[PDB]
């Protein structure tokens, strides 16, 4: 890696010259460099622990031990970054001296004093200095970022390894949870990282302050000292204010997150919601919640207003009160223009320190908190790194207090089938997990030679977020026949058909979390597939289904078939393999009788069984409102148009002081002129604050109404998370941190134009050099927008699977400890951790390369503006604007490009306008061939199917073919359709929610074509086969409607046997329906929906195929509700198990992908005959 290029990043050239042609992948990203490989960085830091193992006063480690480690860990390279930061800031001060030396020499008409003569000389010295000044600051930024990158994994590995020695009794799910270590990755690493991003500056920024003060003092003196203290002492007002901003952010998330959870609630069961036709109330609850969310973001704006304001006003507010003190209150010194310009030059320089200092103080304190949160975590209880026998042990599920099981001996040699049974809890999975060694074995011995002289599945499912076949893999090689000898041997093929892509589907997170009869079944699959010797399966009949338990007996018969002298030692509860078992159970509350033979046992007990241009107009010009957007224009214009003009006065009035109406009268004019922008800047801060507040209020209102009427076929076709990705991230983008980018950029780019416009007006042949120059400025930017985008979205796709690895590492901790797969997963830890760090490198690479290449360009401006500006002799005050803006180009094009880059990312959120607005269909009501129709009630259950020819999506295949059917009042049609072509296709279709390609549907006599679907589909009962539990209040779960009752609400739900089962409600008839059906049953969950079906008062309850019913007695109570509570209408008995066809009134077995036969009466035909089959 070559050194002057290691200065200015020349290796990035061919990278980005690559990047204009091809898009960029992780393959286009590289290997890690030798030191940047994370395990090396981990390696040195463990040595730093061993170094302070020599100290060992109280070595938990602890925080005092940590920072003594970390300083001697990374500090040498940190010193090098600090040294460049110092020397650069020192030459940061030298430029102002150069300005002073020019104008002082140019008020006029070998020795070093003579060598200090010429503005030729001093300007060239200025240029050649300001190369280094504008270079070593981008060394010192760089190396410090290439320090925190080397922090990241070298912390994260220590974290992850302590997870590899973590113990799990109550602490692992109590005080600290998966989230509580997850944010500890997600925050406290970055708290450390941004600390070491800023760690030089806390050493150094006050030295920049004090030497800025002293090099102001040798310009004015006591007027310097009285002027400086505003800008010095007023920066911790930012430390006051941003504290309130953090307080507002705490107010933000605490009010946003539950709302977003309720948005996910409204979105997940959106099909049932529009099936309930309940978009209005469900959206209205989020709408009035949003009113308070806006009221919180109101203060978020009021906080973020003055941050900008005091960041911008206090420069001028210092500079004027500095000068009026030098003019009025003191009046001693003559005021040269050289003074007056370079005074402002330092004033421009010193702020870019000063309003980072609060963020420094914040981050330093936050990280010093976070190291304690790291430490007091990190010194918690380890997991005691130290045939299947147990020789008389004393095990404890607890840590070293009260034991759980003593005197426990067991033995399981090879070639053996053994379960363990008893009472749950005491062996919920307990004694098997005690065999794992995941308990405080206070005494006794145990033998596998597993550690020193292994498969498992947990009683809770801990799957992985991957492909389903990859979840079946669980760090395995491939054998697709053996996989067919597993997956088909598990019979997950129906669940694989329920998956959209089967073996290539999306298991874990972002997928339908099915039952353990799928999920834990897939775990038992990866268990059996694992090609291990000994297995420990856990009570899978509790997770299985009934016929799945029959297949689980068959899977046990495939297990022992697959047990080619294996040692699978399961445990269960049922009496199924109580006949078929090699050895026996032992659990009463501890060691029950042994595994040998139930002959001499108590078996009687067991025998009981480019850019985005128009999108900104879609942001603003469609939604801003014109008058405030015009104020956003004009206030931005007229602020800077008087700001640089205040500097234009600030030269020439002192040029008259260099000469000699009244200049003291000129000064108070200038004073109030400086006060004018000080007045304006408040309205400038209030503009974008109020603007983005109004923008996001209507934008979120619009997207709410946009999704509020969309058809359900879309939502089945839409991946629901891709919608909520527009609601979670993009909304918070548009609210919390969209417009500050704009307010920065509108402050930025005008000043970028403006300083050029000044130096143009100074020298009329400036622009002749600018025109080749700004070419280069543009073409570097034009390449740059490609790269910084592709890095930034790369970043976005990178640390997310990194912490996803953590979450699975938390949850499936036990099972990887069982497989002893830490070596695999520490490797695959790195395999992400690397790709984070190398992406972060190339991000922070072009983060440097851009501005340093643009910075030399800015320096070229300086010299050219100087050399042109020599001819003002051939006036002299008007030089001083040139010099003061020549040096002030840099922070401008620093931000003026980078923010324009990040605006493109900020626009990528509001790209989802088209995902919202353009996607719009399905006017629900409003067709309405009558305006007057009280047959939304109907007392006549004679529906009709007037040769209705429906298509599914009007895309691939029809559902019917001219079905000229009808219905009779009381004719409860037992629905019998195709096993894979027409099952659900006649209920939501009967709610007109599909592409009925021909044929009408007469309802209460009249066709349902032009009728209010909001009125029709809400006054029609349908108890579908999805668990519909709207979280909230109990009356809100029961009756969130207009004519809500409590007597009838307590009547039919007692007829549903829920208002008497939950008669001990916490709030009674207005109780809280907490968690959306996590405390109530799975059966009364639907019985409350049956009471809602009573509440519609048109009880033609179109039920669905309730294939997941736990109690068949509860389904018989539902049959009693079909008997007693269904008031003799056309119950469309959709049945995946045709057992419920036993109560047929007038069925229509319309099947084989078609309309087979009207099944009434006595139709025990080839489906009802094969209903037993």
UniProtKB/Swiss-Prot annotation:
Its main location: membrane. One of its GO terms (molecular function) is metal ion binding. Residues 219-224, 322-340, 648-669, 764, 868-879 are extracellular. Gene3D superfamilies: ABC transporter type 1, transmembrane domain, P-loop containing nucleotide triphosphate hydrolases. KATP channels are regulated by cytoplasmic ATP/ADP ratios; ATP inhibits the channel by closing the pore, while ADP activates the channel. Activated by phosphatidylinositol 4,5-biphosphate (PtdIns(4,5)P2). Residues 388-609, 943-1173 form the ABC transporter domain. Residues 1-82, 137-202, 238-305, 357-629, 687-745, 778-851, 896-1173 are cytoplasmic. Mg(2+) binds at residues 429, 459. ATP binds at residues 397, 425, 429-430, 1081. Residues 78-366, 629-905 form the ABC transmembrane type-1 domain. InterPro entries: AAA+_ATPase, ABC1_TM_dom, ABC1_TM_sf, ABC_transporter-like_ATP-bd, ABC_transporter-like_CS, ABC_transporter_C-like, ABCC8, ABCC8/9. Keywords: ATP-binding, Cell membrane, Disulfide bond, Glycoprotein, Magnesium, Membrane, Metal-binding, Nucleotide-binding, Receptor, Repeat, Transmembrane, Transmembrane helix, Transport. The keyword Magnesium applies. ADP binds at residues 979-980, 982-985. SUPFAM superfamilies: ABC transporter transmembrane region (SSF90123), P-loop containing nucleoside triphosphate hydrolases (SSF52540). It is a multi-pass membrane protein. CDD domains: ABC_6TM_SUR1_D1_like, ABC_6TM_SUR1_D2_like. Forms an heterooctamer with KCNJ11; four ABCC8/SUR1 molecules interact with one KCNJ11 homotetramer. Regulator subunit of pancreatic ATP-sensitive potassium channel (KATP), playing a major role in the regulation of insulin release. In pancreatic cells, it forms KATP channels with KCNJ11; KCNJ11 forms the channel pore while ABCC8 is required for activation and regulation. Belongs to the ABC transporter superfamily. ABCC family. Conjugate transporter (TC 3.A.1.208) subfamily. This is ATP-binding cassette sub-family C member 8. It comes from Cricetus cricetus. The gene is ABCC8.
């Amino acid at each position: 890696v070559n050194l002057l290029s290691k200065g200015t990043y020349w290796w990035m050239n061919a990278f980005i010259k690559t990047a204009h042609k091809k898009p960029i992948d992780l393959r286009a990203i590289a290997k890690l460099p030798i030191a940047m490989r994370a395990l090396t960085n981990y390696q040195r830091l463990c040595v730093a622990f061993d170094a302070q193992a020599r100290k060992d006063t109280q070595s938990p480690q602890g925080a005092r031990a940590i920072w003594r480690a970390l300083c001697h860990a990374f500090g040498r390279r940190l010193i090098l970054s600090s040294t460049f930061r110092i020397l650069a800031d020192l030459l940061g001060f030298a430029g102002p001296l150069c300005i002073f030396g020019i104008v002082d020499h140019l008020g006029k008409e070998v020795s070093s004093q003579e060598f200090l003569g010429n503005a030729y000389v001093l300007a060239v010295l200025l240029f050649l200095a300001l190369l280094l000044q504008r270079t070593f600051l981008q060394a010192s930024y760089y190396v410090a970022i290439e320090t925190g990158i080397n922090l990241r994994g070298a912390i994260q590995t220590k974290i992850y390894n302590k997870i590899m020695h973590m113990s799990t009794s109550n602490l692992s799910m109590g005080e600290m949870t998966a989230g509580q270590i997850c944010n500890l990755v997600a925050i406290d690493t970055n708290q450390l990282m941004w600390f070491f991003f800023l760690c030089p500056n806390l050493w150094t920024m006050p030295v920049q302050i004090i030497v800025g003060v002293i090099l102001l003092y040798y310009i004015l003196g006591v007027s310097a000292l009285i002027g400086a203290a505003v800008i010095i002492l007023l920066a911790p007002v930012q430390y006051f204010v941003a504290t309130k901003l953090s307080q507002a952010q705490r107010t933000t998330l605490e009010h946003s997150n539950e709302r977003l959870k309720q948005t996910n609630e409204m979105l997940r069961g959106m099909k049932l919601l529009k099936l309930y036709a309940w978009e209005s109330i469900f959206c209205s609850r989020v709408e009035v919640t949003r009113r308070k969310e806006m009221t919180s973001l109101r203060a978020f704006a009021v906080y973020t207003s003055i941050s900008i304001f005091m960041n911008t006003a206090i420069p001028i507010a210092a500079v004027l009160i500095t000068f009026v003190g030098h003019v009025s209150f003191f009046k001693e010194s003559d005021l040269s223009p050289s003074v007056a310009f370079a005074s402002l030059s330092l004033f421009h320089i010193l702020v870019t320190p000063l309003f980072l200092l609060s963020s420094v103080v914040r981050s330093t304190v936050k990280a010093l908190v976070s190291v304690q949160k790291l430490s007091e975590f990190l010194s918690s209880a380890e997991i005691r790194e130290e045939c299947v026998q147990i020789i008389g042990g004393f095990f404890t599920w607890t840590p070293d207090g009260i034991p759980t099981l003593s005197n426990i001996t067991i033995r399981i040699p090879r070639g053996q089938l053994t379960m363990i049974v008893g009472q749950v809890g005491c062996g919920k999975s307990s004694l098997l997990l005690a065999t794992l060694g995941e308990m405080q074995k206070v005494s006794g011995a145990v033998f596998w030679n597993s550690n020193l002289p292994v498969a498992y599945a947990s009683q809770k499912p801990w799957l992985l977020n991957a492909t389903v076949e990859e979840n079946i893999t669980f760090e395995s090689p491939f054998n697709k026949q053996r996989y067919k000898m597993v997956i088909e041997a598990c019979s997950l093929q129906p669940d694989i058909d329920i998956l959209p892509h089967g073996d290539q589907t999306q298991i874990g997170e972002r997928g339908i979390n099915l039952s353990g009869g799928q999920r834990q079944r897939i775990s038992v699959a990866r268990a059996l597939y694992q090609q291990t010797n000994v297995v420990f399966l856990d009570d899978p009949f509790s997770a299985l289904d009934v016929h799945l338990s029959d297949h689980l007996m068959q899977a046990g018969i495939l297990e022992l078939l697959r047990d080619d002298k294996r040692t699978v030692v399961l445990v269960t509860h049922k009496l199924q393999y109580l006949p078929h078992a090699d050895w026996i159970i032992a659990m009463k509350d501890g060691t029950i009788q042994r595994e040998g033979t139930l002959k001499d046992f108590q078996r009687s007990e067991c025998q009981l069984f480019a850019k985005i241009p128009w999108r900104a107009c879609t942001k603003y010009l469609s939604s801003a409102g014109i008058l405030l957007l015009s104020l956003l224009v004009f206030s931005q214009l007229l602020k800077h148009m008087v700001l640089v003009a205040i500097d234009y006065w600030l030269a020439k009035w002192t040029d008259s002081a260099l000469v000699l109406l009244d200049q003291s009268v000129y000064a108070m004019v200038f004073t109030l002129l400086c006060s004018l922008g000080i007045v304006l800047c408040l309205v400038t801060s209030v503009t974008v604050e109020w603007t983005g507040l109004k923008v996001a209020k209507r934008l979120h209102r619009s997207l709410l109404n946009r999704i509020i009427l969309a058809p359900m076929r879309f939502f089945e076709t839409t991946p629901l998370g891709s919608i909520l990705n527009r609601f979670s991230s993009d909304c918070n983008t548009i609210d919390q941190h969209i417009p500050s980018t704009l307010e920065c950029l509108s402050r930025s780019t005008l000043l970028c134009v403006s300083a050029l416009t000044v130096i143009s007006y100074v020298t009329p042949v400036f622009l002749v050099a600018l025109l080749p120059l700004a070419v280069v400025c543009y073409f570097i930017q034009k390449y740059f927008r490609v790269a910084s985008r592709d890095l930034q979205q790369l970043d976005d796709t990178t640390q997310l699977p990194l912490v996803s690895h953590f979450a699975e590492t938390v949850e499936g901790l036990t099972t990887i400890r069982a497989f002893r797969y830490e070596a695999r997963f520490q490797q695959k830890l790195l395999e992400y951790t690397d790709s984070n760090n190398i992406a972060s490198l190339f991000l922070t690479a072009a983060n440097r390369w851009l501005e340093v290449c643009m910075e030399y360009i800015g320096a070229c401006v300086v010299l050219i503006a100087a050399a042109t500006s020599i001819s003002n002799s051939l006036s002299a005050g008007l030089v001083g604007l040139g010099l003061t803006y020549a040096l002030m180009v840099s922070n401008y094009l620093n931000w003026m490009v980078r923010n324009l880059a990040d605006m493109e990312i900020q626009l990528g959120a509001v790209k989802r306008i088209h995902a919202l607005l353009k996607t719009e269909a399905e006017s629900y009501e409003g067709l309405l061939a009558p305006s007057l129709i009280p047959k939304n009630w109907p007392d006549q259950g004679k529906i009709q199917i007037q040769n209705l020819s429906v298509r599914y999506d009007s895309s691939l295949k029809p559902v019917l073919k001219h079905v000229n059917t009808l219905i009779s009042p009381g004719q409860k049609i037992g629905i019998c359709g195709r096993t894979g072509s027409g099952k659900s296709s006649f209920s939501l279709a009967f709610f007109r929610m599909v592409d009925m390609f021909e044929g009408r549907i007469i309802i209460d006599g009249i066709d349902i074509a032009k009728l209010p679907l909001h009125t029709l589909r809400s006054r029609l009962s349908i108890i579908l086969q999805d668990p519909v539990l709207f979280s909230g209040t109990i009356r809100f779960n029961l009756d969130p409607e207009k004519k809500c009752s409590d007597s009838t609400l307590w009547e039919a739900l007692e007829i549903a046997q829920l208002k008497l089962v939950v008669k001990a409600l916490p709030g009674g008839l207005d109780a809280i329906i907490t968690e959306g059906g996590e405390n109530f049953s799975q059966g009364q969950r639907q019985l409350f929906c049956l009471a809602r079906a009573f509440v519609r008062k048109t009880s033609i309850f179109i039920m669905d195929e309730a294939t997941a019913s736990i109690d068949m007695a509860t389904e018989n109570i539902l049959q009693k509700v079909v008997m007693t509570a269904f008031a003799d209408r056309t119950v469309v008995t959709i049945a995946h198990r045709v057992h419920t066809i036993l109560s047929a009134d007038l069925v229509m077995v319309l099947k084989r992908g078609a309309i087979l036969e009207f099944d009434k009466p006595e139709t025990l035909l080839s489906q009802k005959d094969s209903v037993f089959a």
